[PDB]
């Protein structure tokens, strides 16, 4: 099953992930299907978390299953807010 | 039979000017005539005109030269210091508009044959088209 998860791209002690849509079976830093955001856990800049809400919503609409950490970040960015 | 009339012409010219001829005849063809026009307009030759030798169509090509000169060897400078053939039967050279070259930083020309007629690298560039790079003159 396809997933919305984090791919490590930073560097030693300098982790920067990419919120990605990749098949579940792929290596993590492998070939993903689409990038839909990024995440700097050490929030080293005012922009430490962006997410293409429209896109995330798209994939969720077709099966994509988020990691419990990706779900958390996707939420923080209002992917699930339905007000 | 000539294997390449266009080169034949550029040479007849190259040769005629190297001995400061006044004119020079070359068997006619629309295409040849077409190149002469470019040649005229750019001011490389004085001009040309249709004539008949032995009853067959030719093209007198009135050449141009600089003025007489000083010191040993008064022979004038050439208006055509250069005239080479690019495309040749059995090795045609075609270029895209972004591929048209610039002869001597512009002080020279390049005659291309495009599907919009025969034109200089500037004209061709302007109309935004490429074609067969015929020759370069400077």
């Amino acid at each position: 099953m396809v997933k919305i998860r984090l791919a490590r791209f930073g560097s030693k002690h300098n982790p920067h992930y990419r919120i990605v849509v990749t098949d579940a079976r792929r290596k993590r830093d492998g070939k993903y299907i689409e990038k839909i955001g990024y995440y700097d856990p050490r929030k080293t800049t005012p922009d430490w978390l962006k997410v293409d809400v429209e896109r995330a919503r798209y994939w969720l609409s077709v099966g994509a299953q988020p990691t419990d950490t990706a779900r958390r970040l996707l939420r923080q960015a209002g992917v699930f807010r339905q007000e | 039979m000539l294997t390449d009339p266009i080169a034949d012409m550029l040479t007849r010219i190259r040769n005629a000017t190297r001995v400061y001829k006044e004119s020079t005849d070359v068997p006619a063809s629309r295409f040849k005539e077409e190149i002469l026009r470019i040649l005229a307009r750019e001011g490389f030759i004085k001009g040309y005109e249709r004539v008949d030798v032995d009853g067959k169509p030719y093209l007198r090509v009135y050449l141009k030269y600089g003025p007489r000169r000083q010191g040993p060897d008064p022979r004038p400078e050439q208006v055509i210091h250069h005239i080479r053939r690019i495309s040749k039967p059995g090795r045609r050279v075609y270029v895209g508009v972004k591929e048209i070259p610039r002869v001597r930083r512009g002080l020279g020309i390049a005659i291309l044959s495009t599907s919009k007629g025969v034109l200089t690298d500037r004209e061709a560039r302007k109309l935004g088209v490429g074609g067969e790079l015929i020759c370069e003159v400077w």
């Binding site: - | 059995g90 090795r91 045609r92 050279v93 075609y94």
Partner: protein
């Protein structure tokens, strides 16, 4: 889109199968000179409809056999052995190229 090619039927000694000779032209990658290479395709002809000398269109098809992966789309121009000739001859010169014998 399924690829379409045009060529000459240079053989039909096969049941429901003709040999189409297709040619192509391209600028030599380093030398520029336009060079002309050519290849033979075994196209499918279920009705023995096409004959030697026929210029036809061939179309990328689903396998009919090992080797056969094309079907005759349509006849572009009837008879003209002038082309078939070149072929037969070029193949006939092969005789005079070994350690045996052939024709000049």
């Amino acid at each position: 889109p399924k690829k379409v090619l045009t060529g000459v039927v240079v053989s039909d000694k096969m049941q429901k199968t003709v040999t189409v000779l297709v040619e192509r032209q391209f600028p030599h990658p380093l030398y520029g000179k336009v060079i002309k290479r050519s290849k033979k395709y075994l196209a499918h002809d279920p009705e023995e409809k096409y004959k030697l000398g026929d210029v036809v269109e061939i179309i990328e098809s689903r396998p009919i056999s090992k080797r056969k992966r094309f079907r005759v789309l349509r006849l572009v121009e009837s008879g003209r052995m002038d082309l078939v000739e070149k072929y037969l001859i070029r193949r006939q010169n092969y005789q005079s190229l070994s350690k045996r014998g052939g024709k000049a």
